[PDB]
Enzyme design. Sequence first.
Site, PDB file in Angstrom:
ATOM      1  N   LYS A  41       0.797  -1.226   0.000  1.00 47.37           N
ATOM      2  CA  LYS A  41       0.000   0.000   0.000  1.00 47.37           C
ATOM      3  C   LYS A  41       0.831   1.278   0.000  1.00 47.37           C
ATOM      4  O   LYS A  41       0.314   2.341   0.337  1.00 47.37           O
ATOM      5  CB  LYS A  41      -0.977   0.048   1.189  1.00 47.37           C
ATOM      6  CG  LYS A  41      -1.747  -1.233   1.495  1.00 47.37           C
ATOM      7  CD  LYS A  41      -2.230  -1.967   0.246  1.00 47.37           C
ATOM      8  CE  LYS A  41      -3.059  -1.088  -0.666  1.00 47.37           C
ATOM      9  NZ  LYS A  41      -3.397  -1.812  -1.925  1.00 47.37           N
ATOM     10  N   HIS A 101       7.217  -7.196  -2.130  1.00 48.81           N
ATOM     11  CA  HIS A 101       7.080  -6.543  -0.823  1.00 48.81           C
ATOM     12  C   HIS A 101       7.946  -7.261   0.199  1.00 48.81           C
ATOM     13  O   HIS A 101       7.892  -6.956   1.397  1.00 48.81           O
ATOM     14  CB  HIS A 101       5.642  -6.586  -0.291  1.00 48.81           C
ATOM     15  CG  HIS A 101       4.631  -5.925  -1.173  1.00 48.81           C
ATOM     16  ND1 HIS A 101       4.745  -4.618  -1.594  1.00 48.81           N
ATOM     17  CD2 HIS A 101       3.467  -6.390  -1.691  1.00 48.81           C
ATOM     18  CE1 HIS A 101       3.703  -4.311  -2.349  1.00 48.81           C
ATOM     19  NE2 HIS A 101       2.913  -5.369  -2.422  1.00 48.81           N
ATOM     20  N   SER A 131      -4.785   2.569   4.667  1.00 46.30           N
ATOM     21  CA  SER A 131      -4.848   1.943   3.354  1.00 46.30           C
ATOM     22  C   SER A 131      -4.854   0.424   3.487  1.00 46.30           C
ATOM     23  O   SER A 131      -5.680  -0.253   2.881  1.00 46.30           O
ATOM     24  CB  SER A 131      -3.671   2.392   2.487  1.00 46.30           C
ATOM     25  OG  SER A 131      -3.742   1.812   1.194  1.00 46.30           O
TER      26      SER A 131
HETATM   27  N1  LIG Z   1      -1.555   7.224  -9.506  1.00 43.91           N
HETATM   28  C1  LIG Z   1      -1.685   7.204  -8.160  1.00 43.91           C
HETATM   29  N2  LIG Z   1      -1.451   8.313  -7.423  1.00 43.91           N
HETATM   30  C2  LIG Z   1      -1.574   8.318  -6.083  1.00 43.91           C
HETATM   31  N3  LIG Z   1      -1.932   7.234  -5.374  1.00 43.91           N
HETATM   32  C3  LIG Z   1      -2.194   6.053  -5.983  1.00 43.91           C
HETATM   33  C4  LIG Z   1      -2.084   5.968  -7.445  1.00 43.91           C
HETATM   34  N4  LIG Z   1      -2.395   4.703  -7.779  1.00 43.91           N
HETATM   35  C5  LIG Z   1      -2.680   4.036  -6.629  1.00 43.91           C
HETATM   36  N5  LIG Z   1      -2.557   4.844  -5.559  1.00 43.91           N
HETATM   37  C6  LIG Z   1      -2.787   4.494  -4.132  1.00 43.91           C
HETATM   38  O1  LIG Z   1      -1.728   3.703  -3.584  1.00 43.91           O
HETATM   39  C7  LIG Z   1      -2.274   2.780  -2.631  1.00 43.91           C
HETATM   40  C8  LIG Z   1      -2.044   1.350  -3.095  1.00 43.91           C
HETATM   41  O2  LIG Z   1      -0.653   1.175  -3.329  1.00 43.91           O
HETATM   42  P1  LIG Z   1      -0.025  -0.262  -3.663  1.00 43.91           P
HETATM   43  O3  LIG Z   1      -0.037  -0.327  -5.170  1.00 43.91           O
HETATM   44  O4  LIG Z   1       1.344  -0.153  -3.037  1.00 43.91           O
HETATM   45  O5  LIG Z   1      -0.941  -1.256  -2.999  1.00 43.91           O
HETATM   46  C9  LIG Z   1      -3.754   3.093  -2.537  1.00 43.91           C
HETATM   47  O6  LIG Z   1      -3.880   4.103  -1.541  1.00 43.91           O
HETATM   48  P2  LIG Z   1      -5.233   4.475  -0.753  1.00 43.91           P
HETATM   49  O7  LIG Z   1      -5.647   3.202  -0.059  1.00 43.91           O
HETATM   50  O8  LIG Z   1      -4.766   5.570   0.170  1.00 43.91           O
HETATM   51  O9  LIG Z   1      -6.191   4.938  -1.824  1.00 43.91           O
HETATM   52  C10 LIG Z   1      -4.041   3.669  -3.902  1.00 43.91           C
HETATM   53  O10 LIG Z   1      -5.213   4.477  -3.901  1.00 43.91           O
HETATM   54  N1  LIG Z   2      -4.684 -12.145  -2.740  1.00 45.19           N
HETATM   55  C1  LIG Z   2      -4.069 -11.230  -3.019  1.00 45.19           C
HETATM   56  C2  LIG Z   2      -3.278 -10.085  -3.332  1.00 45.19           C
HETATM   57  C3  LIG Z   2      -2.347  -9.620  -2.418  1.00 45.19           C
HETATM   58  C4  LIG Z   2      -1.590  -8.513  -2.758  1.00 45.19           C
HETATM   59  C5  LIG Z   2      -0.640  -8.030  -1.867  1.00 45.19           C
HETATM   60  C6  LIG Z   2       0.125  -6.922  -2.207  1.00 45.19           C
HETATM   61  C7  LIG Z   2      -0.066  -6.301  -3.435  1.00 45.19           C
HETATM   62  O1  LIG Z   2       0.677  -5.215  -3.768  1.00 45.19           O
HETATM   63  C8  LIG Z   2      -1.017  -6.786  -4.324  1.00 45.19           C
HETATM   64  C9  LIG Z   2      -1.783  -7.895  -3.991  1.00 45.19           C
HETATM   65  O2  LIG Z   2      -2.706  -8.342  -4.894  1.00 45.19           O
HETATM   66  C10 LIG Z   2      -3.441  -9.440  -4.553  1.00 45.19           C
HETATM   67  O3  LIG Z   2      -4.273  -9.869  -5.351  1.00 45.19           O
END
Ligand SMILES: Nc1ncnc2c1ncn2[C@@H]1O[C@H](COP(=O)(O)O)[C@@H](OP(=O)(O)O)[C@H]1O
Ligand SMILES: N#Cc1cc2ccc(O)cc2oc1=O
Length: 288
Positions: A41, A101, A131
């Site tokens: 996240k 990760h 998040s």
């Molecule tokens: N282009 C962008 N700009 C800013 N935030 C983004 C983005 N694309 C995804 N995110 C945010 O990054 C988080 C997910 O990141 P990851 O890809 O590491 O899982 C989510 O945060 P939120 O839950 O705060 O919306 C998502 O909304």
């Molecule tokens: N099940 C499951 C998942 C876990 C997961 C963990 C981290 C991530 O960046 C993306 C991910 O997408 C997934 O679909």
Amino acid sequence: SRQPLEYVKGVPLIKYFAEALGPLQSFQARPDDLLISTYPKSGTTWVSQILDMIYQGGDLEKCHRAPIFNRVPFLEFKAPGIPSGMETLKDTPAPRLLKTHLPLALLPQTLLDQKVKVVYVARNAKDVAVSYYHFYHMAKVHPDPGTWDSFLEKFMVGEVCYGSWYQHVQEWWELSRTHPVLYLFYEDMKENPKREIQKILEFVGHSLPEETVDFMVQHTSFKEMKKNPMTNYTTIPQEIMDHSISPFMRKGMAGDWKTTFTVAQNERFDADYAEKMAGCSLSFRSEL
Ligand SMILES: Nc1ncnc2c1ncn2[C@@H]1O[C@H](COP(=O)(O)O)[C@@H](OP(=O)(O)O)[C@H]1O
Ligand SMILES: N#Cc1cc2ccc(O)cc2oc1=O
């Protein structure tokens, strides 16, 4: 699904990711690989999309060739019905973008021996926590997160998939001391994405025209990426991810945590945070 976590070398993990570590043992890194490494996240998808566009010379039609999770293989990934990071990666042409990760304790050694370039993205822990809580619900493979207060407690002791945020952000920060690591912050990306992108462009060696960068700066914005089905995960089956319960592209803001954290949770989080990030050069912005 919703199995409890399994532990490996002190790292808690979704059962399927854990198994994934087996096949992941055969993985051989190439010198031209580029690793995308973040605590969950913290902006993996943001930077993945950025990086892939650079790798396609800016062409947008090429980036729609497949889901981001297919364009950028997920190293530790494996799930019931749907290719494992290792499969998808067999059909993956070099130069390869790879996603992880995994903390260093679990990271495939080949990546360090081959001196693979790492792009590391860090985000403030409060936003990561919120998040991640929402992500836990929608991503059905994870255990019940419980109530928010309950989940916040686990997150402070690192009893969530991938372990401690405090250990993750700090161990890669020290690695950067001495491995080619571009170490970035989600909030800087939020503040001025153009600036961050030039940094990335420089890091990877490429060079692109302004017209082309502004182009990328805009197709990497939250709203555009929220629109694009090749980035919003809406083609990943319902069973793995229900966007009803909560979108993958949820808010995309810095400072969102203030509407979730209670004053008491904040004071307790702040006090513990001090202890844990003591004697550390890393300096985070909770808000813009
Ligand atoms: N282009 C962008 N700009 C800013 N935030 C983004 C983005 N694309 C995804 N995110 C945010 O990054 C988080 C997910 O990141 P990851 O890809 O590491 O899982 C989510 O945060 P939120 O839950 O705060 O919306 C998502 O909304
Ligand atoms: N099940 C499951 C998942 C876990 C997961 C963990 C981290 C991530 O960046 C993306 C991910 O997408 C997934 O679909």
